[PDB]
Amino acid sequence: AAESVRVAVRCRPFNQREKDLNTTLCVGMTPNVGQVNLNAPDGAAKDFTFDGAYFMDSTGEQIYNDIVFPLVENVIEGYNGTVFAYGQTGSGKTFSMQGIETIPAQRGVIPRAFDHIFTATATTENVKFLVHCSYLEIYNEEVRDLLGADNKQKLEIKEQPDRGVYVAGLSMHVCHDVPACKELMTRGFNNRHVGATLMNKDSSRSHSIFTVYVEGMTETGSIRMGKLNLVDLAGSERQSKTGATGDRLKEATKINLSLSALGNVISALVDGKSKHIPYRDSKLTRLLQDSLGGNTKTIMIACVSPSSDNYDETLSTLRYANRAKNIKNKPTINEDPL
Numbered sequence: 103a104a105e106s107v108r109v110a111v112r113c114r115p116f117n118q119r120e121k122d123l124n125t126t127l128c129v130g131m132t133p134n135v136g137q138v139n140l141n142a143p144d145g146a147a148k149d150f151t152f153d154g155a156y157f158m159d160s161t162g163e164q165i166y167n168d169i170v171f172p173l174v175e176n177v178i179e180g181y182n183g184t185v186f187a188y189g190q191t192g193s194g195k196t197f198s199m200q201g202i203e204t205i206p207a208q209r210g211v212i213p214r215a216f217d218h219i220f221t222a223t224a225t226t227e228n229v230k231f232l233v234h235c236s237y238l239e240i241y242n243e244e245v246r247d248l249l250g251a252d253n254k255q256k257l258e259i260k261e262q263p264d265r266g267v268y269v270a271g272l273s274m275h276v277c278h279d280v281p282a283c284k285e286l287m288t289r290g291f292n293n294r295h296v297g298a299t300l301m302n303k304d305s306s307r308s309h310s311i312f313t314v315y316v317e318g319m320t321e322t323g324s325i326r327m328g329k330l331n332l333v334d335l336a337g338s339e340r341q342s343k344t345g346a347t348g349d350r351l352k353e354a355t356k357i358n359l360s361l362s363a364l365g366n367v368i369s370a371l372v373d374g375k376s377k378h379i380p381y382r383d384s385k386l387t388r389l390l391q392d393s394l395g396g397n398t399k400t401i402m403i404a405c406v407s408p409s410s411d412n413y414d415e416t417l418s419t420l421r422y423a424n425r426a427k428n429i430k431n432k433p434t435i436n437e438d439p440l
């Protein structure tokens with residue numbers, strides 16, 4: 103039967119901008135029951151329930167072990183899996199996906215997924231595994247390869263019933279171990295479009311997708327074809343807060359439009375009346391199409407600011423996250439016999 107997309111909310115500690123503005127804590131949580139509340143200046147609260155609720159003291163270790171670990175186990179079995187970080191600029195999407203390599207509890211989703219996969223392949227002798235990685239970015243409505251030779255070359259999207267939506271000409275890289283995956287992640291990080299604003303000095307100016315392909319040849323002949331999409335979206339932002347001008351501002355209009363398209367896809371999927379879903383409104387929603395309503399086990403990590411200054415932006419993240427938990431997917435094991 104169909105299963106829901108799983109949603110977790112992560113509230114990061116205050117940033118310097120928020121402390122200088124003398125803002126107050128407007129986010130509350132009861133983690134053991136997945137509860138999150140948002141308080142307005144008058145005191146009125148809006149209550150929500152999610153699959154996970156992680157507060158200012160939460161670690162990447164906790165988040166991964168609780169919600170991501172089962173999904174990565176599903177990819178090893180032959181399922182398609184997707185983890186995507188969503189939220190306002192500077193909320194903690196890149197920190198949640200990449201993290202800090204030198205602090206064990208602070209390592210992100212992506213490096214932990216590499217360790218988990220290669221430990222599972224190393225402890226299985228009756229299945230031979232081949233692991234490939236790809237890494238792309240959607241920058242100003244152009245799909246670009248972050249591991250290719252021409253990072254400026256616009257790539258085209260193709261569709262096929264047995265493959266879903268894919269990127270034609272996207273380079274594929276064999277990874278025999280965790281260092282190989284890390285070398286690609288480093289190379290890709292250097293090529294990703296980034297830029298400074300008053301909301302985030304290290305703002306991601308594109309949506310990124312790191313895909314790990316897990317192919318397993320079983321002793322009963324058959325080939326399992328698991329695939330893990332690790333998605334670090336760009337975030338919603340406002341010119342009055344970022345202070346963005348020129349090219350930085352042009353990126354903001356394309357980022358905001360593509361994120362509005364994702365919101366519209368989420369809303370149409372759960373309104374109970376939309377016969378057609380607007381996946382083609384952006385390259386982002388076309389590449390997330392199979393993850394939202396399709397053949398995939400999906401997790402959204404909705405990141406939020408704890409500050410009263412970001413009440414409106416945090417409320418928007420929570421409303422879309424609340425809607426996303428009702429999206430119904432039909433994941434199946436991808437397994438080609440002989």
Ligand SMILES: Nc1ncnc2c1ncn2[C@@H]1O[C@H](COP(=O)(O)OP(=O)(O)NP(=O)(O)O)[C@@H](O)[C@H]1O
Pocket residue numbers: 113114115189190191192193194195196197198302304305306307335336337338405
């Ligand atoms: N939970 C956290 N604990 C400590 N530092 C954090 C946390 N979350 C984020 N940060 C830091 O806060 C800054 C902004 O976070 P970042 O993950 O880059 O935001 P983002 O959601 O990806 N923003 P953007 O790319 O502009 O849409 C970085 O310096 C992070 O390392």
Ligand SMILES: [Mg+2]
Pocket residue numbers: 195196197304305306335336
């Ligand atoms: Mg980021």
